[PDB]
C-alpha cells in the first residue's frame, strides 16, 4: 500500500538556483504515454 507525506507549500521563491537549458525537440507520444525523439 502506498502512502502520502507532506513536503512543503507551493510558492514561487525569489533568488532560487537558476539552471538548465531550453531545447527544441521534435517528439512523438504513443498510446502508452511514452514520448520518443523523432530526430
Amino acid at each position: 500500500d502506498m502512502y502520502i507525506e507532506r513536503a512543503g507549500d507551493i510558492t514561487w521563491e525569489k533568488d532560487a538556483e537558476v539552471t538548465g537549458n531550453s531545447p527544441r525537440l521534435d517528439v512523438a507520444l504513443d498510446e502508452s504515454g511514452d514520448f520518443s525523439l523523432v530526430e
Binding site: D1, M2, Y3, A7, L25, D26, G33, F35
Partner: protein
C-alpha cells in the same frame, strides 16, 4: 487524514525500507499525481484513504478524491520554477526557462532538469505560484540527460 494544500511525497513499503516512488499536489481537496507513479492504485494519508477519481495513461495523469483542479498554463515566454521534491531530500525550487516538445498535435513546454525517477509528480510553477504542470514524463536526449514535458490536465 491530511487534506492541506501543498506538495506531497508518494511512498511505498513493498520494496526495501520506505522507498519514494513519486510526488503529487494536494489542491482544493484533490490529490494530483502522474499515472506511472501509482498505476491508479488507492493511497493512504495517515488514517484516511484516497481513492482515484480520474485517470488517463496517454496523458500520464491521475486525480484522487475529485476531478483535476490545476488549470494554469505556461505563457510560452517566462521562466518557471520546478518545485523538486527528491527522494530523501528537502523540497527545493529550481528556476529554468522551458524548451519545447514539438508534436503533431501541438507544442508543449519542456523542462531540462535531471532528478531521480522518484521525483516524478513535482509541480512546475509560474511567477504567481500557480501550478502549470507536472514533471516526470519525457525523453532522454543525445548526451544522456533527461528532458521532461510540462504535463498539465484539463479542468472542467
Amino acid at each position: 487524514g491530511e487534506t492541506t494544500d501543498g506538495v506531497y511525497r508518494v511512498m511505498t513499503r513493498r520494496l526495501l525500507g520506505s522507498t519514494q516512488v513519486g510526488v503529487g499536489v494536494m489542491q482544493e481537496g484533490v490529490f494530483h499525481t502522474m499515472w506511472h507513479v501509482t498505476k491508479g492504485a488507492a493511497l493512504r494519508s495517515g488514517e484516511g484513504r484516497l481513492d482515484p477519481y480520474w485517470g488517463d495513461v496517454k496523458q500520464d495523469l491521475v486525480s484522487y478524491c475529485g476531478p483535476w483542479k490545476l488549470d494554469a498554463a505556461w505563457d510560452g515566454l517566462s521562466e518557471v520554477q520546478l518545485l523538486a521534491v527528491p527522494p530523501g531530500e528537502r523540497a527545493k525550487n529550481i528556476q529554468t526557462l522551458p524548451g519545447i516538445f514539438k508534436t503533431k498535435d501541438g507544442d508543449i513546454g519542456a523542462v531540462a532538469l535531471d532528478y531521480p525517477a522518484g521525483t516524478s509528480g513535482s509541480p512546475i510553477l509560474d511567477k504567481c505560484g500557480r501550478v502549470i504542470g507536472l514533471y516526470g514524463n519525457g525523453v532522454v536526449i543525445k548526451n544522456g540527460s533527461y528532458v521532461s514535458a510540462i504535463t498539465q490536465g484539463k479542468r472542467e
